[PDB]
Design a protein around this ligand. Structure first.
Ligand SMILES: *[C@@H]1O[C@H](CO)[C@@H](O[C@@H]2O[C@H](CO)[C@@H](O)[C@H](O)[C@H]2NC(C)=O)[C@H](O)[C@H]1NC(C)=O
Ligand SMILES: *[C@@H]1O[C@H](CO)[C@@H](O[C@@H]2O[C@H](CO)[C@@H](O)[C@H](O)[C@H]2NC(C)=O)[C@H](O)[C@H]1NC(C)=O
Ligand SMILES: *[C@@H]1O[C@H](CO)[C@@H](O[C@@H]2O[C@H](CO)[C@@H](O)[C@H](O)[C@H]2NC(C)=O)[C@H](O)[C@H]1NC(C)=O
Ligand SMILES: *[C@@H]1O[C@H](CO)[C@@H](O[C@@H]2O[C@H](CO)[C@@H](O)[C@H](O)[C@H]2NC(C)=O)[C@H](O)[C@H]1NC(C)=O
Ligand SMILES: *[C@@H]1O[C@H](CO)[C@@H](O[C@@H]2O[C@H](CO)[C@@H](O)[C@H](O)[C@H]2NC(C)=O)[C@H](O)[C@H]1NC(C)=O
Ligand SMILES: *[C@@H]1O[C@H](CO)[C@@H](O)[C@H](O)[C@H]1NC(C)=O
Ligand SMILES: *[C@@H]1O[C@H](CO)[C@@H](O)[C@H](O)[C@H]1NC(C)=O
Ligand SMILES: *[C@@H]1O[C@H](CO)[C@@H](O)[C@H](O)[C@H]1NC(C)=O
Ligand SMILES: *[C@@H]1O[C@H](CO)[C@@H](O)[C@H](O)[C@H]1NC(C)=O
Ligand SMILES: *[C@@H]1O[C@H](CO)[C@@H](O)[C@H](O)[C@H]1NC(C)=O
Lengths: 244, 253, 192, 48
């Protein structure tokens, strides 16, 4: 729970959020993991990216094998029978055509295998980067480890591949609020140290950016800089110091 | 000689040339003997034929697409910007794209409203304007923890072909003829060996990123967090997690 | 242009339709910062959004507010200069013109390969068929078939390699869209 | 030409693979928004 709290702290939500609703977060995480099981068991073509490599390699091998049925202009496609029914000086010319056709077929196969191997190497390099940056760390780099703010991810091995379970924080029910970028007090202009200013309509609060937590504005969560004459959107409000 | 359609042309040939030819050495026009008229040549229409199918597991119904032809040369025919598409009823209302036709047109088996393969202009998503103001913000009052799955291929099968017996088999006779081609098969063996050896490096680089094997504690006191769905199961013969077991039961070779 | 066996397939997304995607990405960015890339789009006043992007590079947000007029003027000037810059500097769009040029050149070479004899008496199949008896016309046609098939295969191979390059570029462009447009990248010289 | 076998179903397959991949390239670059967003009719963006 403390590790996940600091991962929350790594996306801009204070730790107190996770601790005040840890039961809810754990329940919601367990539900989200359980839904992966059902989604994979119920939705076909989910593993398509992995099945396609198998399919393409099988198809390339099948066409390579079926190229042995081709004559390429030889009297017959089986080398044994042309060899067993032509004398060498007339069988060499027939065998040469098969040699040329089969060699050039093998060359085509090997070239396409090289290109596909380069593509798979690119994918494996991407998977290595994703392991390092999503599993071994927390990635501040958007949409690299899933939709939402990345918390943590889990690897799962798959046949000839890897599957990543990306746990992300997604914001939910939100409210239209009124704002201002600073407040004016005794001619001093106060900016928020962290978060934004919001009004419930009659009273003004500072909240953090990703979770509504109004606090009364104090000298301890804002900082003064300049006077009220410079910033274009200012609101007059009172700021309290505990010292008084 | 050649084949095509002949039409009148406005290309002012010179009195001595007999036939015109466009870029890339193709006859584009010829002049007529016996009338000296200058007639243009256009290839007569052709193109591929493609078959739209929901799947034999759903219906035997099919739409056919002739790729680059006007609907003037052979139940309901629709002229679209990617060819002539026959067998698909065209719906004004837009849906999410299911089977791509091209040029923004897709087609799918509806199964509810029309019992046919409809054709439509694909939609890009739900429309919503954001309530922008100079003094208003939207801040979330809750959150949802969401887990998404991402699938990446790492390696492929390490195949290896032996030229001498793929091309010849057990025939010294043609092996002697194959020797005349030099190192064509030292090369192919070398290339395939390179592919096969790097397939293992792919897996090593993706997975071998920990120097020591970490073990989970016997007691699972994770503060309400439940991982039984991802940790290996002792009851299994092969010590895989439930999700990995489903993944292994899901791809077929 | 249309030739013997050569056809060009229309792309699935029309240019009228990619412009709507970029319009959506813009509207989302201006009206909601990066929030629309993670979850629901959350409106935020644009100077406030720019203040938080300043805060994202180690500049306090009071800087932006105390010189917002100046920053807006600088941004407007810099945007205006892009139009003139790429309108007056040739070869600016060279990376895009080169793909068109290379594809057109490869197709032109593939078509011009039909003018080659490859050792046949003539390159016109009908001409050689019309004056040679079958058992020798077969031999003459075979050389032409071999040469043309090899030319087509060379074209296909170079297309595969070029498509691999374009895919690498498109993956880079998708990463740049995600990480520069939908976020703010703390990652040096990746987004300029 | 039939005596050369499957060379041309193979070439057609390779070119079709490239053609199918180009649409994936475009889709993965641009189709990253779930919804189509519109800007307000009044452009009061604080001077930008
Ligand atoms: C706006 O904020 C004020 C306080 O900041 C809220 O006023 C409180 O209302 C409750 C009534 O349920 C009283 O018990 C409290 O004493 C009030 N606080 C103060 C400081 O007077 C008000 O409810 C808020 N309104 C909205 C819509 O958020
Ligand atoms: C070839 O011969 C034909 C007739 O033998 C010519 O065709 C004539 O063309 C004139 C046009 O000036 C017409 O008025 C006649 O009616 C045509 N005759 C026939 C029988 O159709 C043609 O012009 C000749 N061309 C050359 C190059 O000698
Ligand atoms: C936030 O405010 C905007 C307007 O200030 C609301 O957008 C309206 O949404 C309704 C849909 O029920 C439309 O009929 C209106 O045309 C929209 N107004 C504008 C100006 O576009 C939005 O619903 C508000 N959301 C919340 C959560 O308060
Ligand atoms: C925050 O989200 C959670 C769920 O994501 C909400 O919890 C639900 O609360 C209702 C009570 O009315 C229960 O019936 C549901 O079973 C709860 N869901 C879960 C997954 O436990 C919670 O109400 C939300 N709170 C706010 C303020 O949005
Ligand atoms: C962790 O979650 C799994 C399921 O998500 C729980 O496993 C269940 O255990 C009970 C035994 O009382 C079985 O009847 C269920 O069939 C199991 N479910 C599955 C899907 O196998 C497990 O008990 C949970 N553990 C903790 C500590 O929460
Ligand atoms: C916001 O818009 C209102 C309405 O046009 C305008 O009066 C005001 O000056 C603007 N700027 C603010 C509130 O900072
Ligand atoms: C804020 O206080 C100053 C002090 O005189 C006053 O002039 C100004 O009008 C006040 N702001 C508003 C919005 O009334
Ligand atoms: C058709 O689909 C059903 C369920 O989707 C499946 O059980 C059945 O095997 C399929 N038929 C085949 C693959 O021939
Ligand atoms: C198809 O043919 C009709 C007349 O036969 C013509 O009017 C129409 O323009 C053609 N469609 C094209 C050229 O796309
Ligand atoms: C589709 O819409 C067009 C224009 O909106 C209209 O002219 C046409 O009749 C409609 N057809 C059907 C079948 O709704």
């Amino acid at each position: 729970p403390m590790q996940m709290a600091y991962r929350f702290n790594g996306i801009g939500v204070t730790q107190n959020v996770l601790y005040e609703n840890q039961k809810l977060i754990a329940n919601q995480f367990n539900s989200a993991i359980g839904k992966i099981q059902d989604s994979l068991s119920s939705t076909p073509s989910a593993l398509g990216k992995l099945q396609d490599v198998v399919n393409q390699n099988a198809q390339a091998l099948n066409t390579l094998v079926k190229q042995l049925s081709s004559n390429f202009g030889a009297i017959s496609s089986v080398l044994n029978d042309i060899l067993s029914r032509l004398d060498p000086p007339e069988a060499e010319v027939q065998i040469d055509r098969l040699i040329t056709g089969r060699l050039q077929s093998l060359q085509t196969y090997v070239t396409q295998q090289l290109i596909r191997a380069a593509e798979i190497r690119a994918s494996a390099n991407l998977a290595a980067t994703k392991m390092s940056e999503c599993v071994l760390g927390q990635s501040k780099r958007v949409d690299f480890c899933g939709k939402g703010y990345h918390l943590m991810s889990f690897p799962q091995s798959a046949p000839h591949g890897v599957v990543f379970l990306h746990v992300t924080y997604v914001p939910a029910q939100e409210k239209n609020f009124t704002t201002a970028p600073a407040i004016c007090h005794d001619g001093k202009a106060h900016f928020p140290r962290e978060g934004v200013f919001v009004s419930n309509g009659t009273h003004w609060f500072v909240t953090q950016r990703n979770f509504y937590e109004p606090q009364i504005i104090t000298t301890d969560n804002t900082f003064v800089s300049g006077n009220c004459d410079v910033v274009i959107g200012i609101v007059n409000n009172t700021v309290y110091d505990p010292l008084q | 000689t050649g084949t095509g359609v002949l039409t009148e042309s406005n290309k002012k040939f010179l009195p001595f040339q007999q036939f015109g030819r466009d870029i890339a050495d193709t006859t584009d026009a010829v002049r007529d003997p016996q009338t000296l008229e200058i007639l243009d040549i256009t290839p007569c229409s052709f193109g591929g034929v493609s078959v739209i199918t929901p799947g034999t597991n759903t219906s035997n119904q099919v739409a056919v697409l002739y790729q680059d032809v006007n609907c003037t040369e052979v139940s309901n025919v629709f002229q679209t910007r990617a060819g002539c598409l026959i067998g698909a009823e065209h719906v004004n209302n837009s849906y999410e794209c299911d089977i791509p036709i091209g040029a923004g047109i897709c087609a799918s088996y509806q199964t509810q409203t029309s019992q046919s393969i409809i054709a439509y202009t694909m939609s890009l998503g739900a429309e919503n304007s954001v309530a922008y103001s100079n003094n208003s913000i939207a801040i979330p009052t809750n959150f949802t923890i969401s887990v998404t799955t991402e699938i990446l291929p790492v390696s492929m099968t390490k195949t290896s072909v032996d030229c001498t017996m793929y091309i010849c088999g057990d025939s010294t006779e043609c092996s002697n003829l194959l020797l005349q081609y030099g190192s064509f098969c030292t090369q192919l063996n070398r290339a395939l060996t390179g592919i096969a050896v790097e397939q293992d490096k792919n897996t090593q680089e993706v997975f071998a990123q920990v120097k020591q094997i970490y073990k989970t504690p016997p007691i699972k006191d994770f503060g309400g967090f439940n991982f039984s769905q991802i940790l290996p199961d002792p009851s299994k013969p092969s010590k895989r997690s439930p999700i990995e077991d489903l993944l292994f039961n899901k791809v077929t070779l | 242009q249309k030739f013997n066996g050569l056809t060009v397939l229309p792309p699935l997304l029309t240019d009228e339709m990619i412009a709507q995607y970029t319009s959506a990405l813009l509207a989302g960015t201006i009206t909601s910062g990066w929030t629309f890339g993670a979850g629901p789009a959350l409106q935020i006043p644009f100077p406030m959004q720019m203040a938080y992007r300043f805060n994202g590079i180690g500049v306090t947000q009071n800087v932006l507010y105390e010189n917002q007029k100046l920053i807006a003027n600088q941004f407007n000037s810099a945007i205006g200069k892009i139009q003139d810059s790429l309108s007056s500097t040739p070869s600016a769009l060279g990376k895009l013109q080169d793909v068109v040029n290379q594809n057109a050149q490869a197709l032109n070479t593939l078509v011009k390969q039909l003018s080659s004899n490859f050792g046949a008496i003539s390159s016109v199949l009908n001409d050689i068929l019309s004056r040679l008896d079958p058992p020798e016309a077969e031999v003459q046609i075979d050389r032409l078939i071999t040469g043309r098939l090899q030319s087509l295969q060379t074209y296909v191979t170079q297309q595969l390699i070029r498509a691999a390059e374009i895919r690498a570029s498109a993956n880079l462009a998708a990463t740049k869209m995600s990480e520069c447009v939908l976020g703010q990248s703390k990652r040096v010289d990746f987004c300029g």
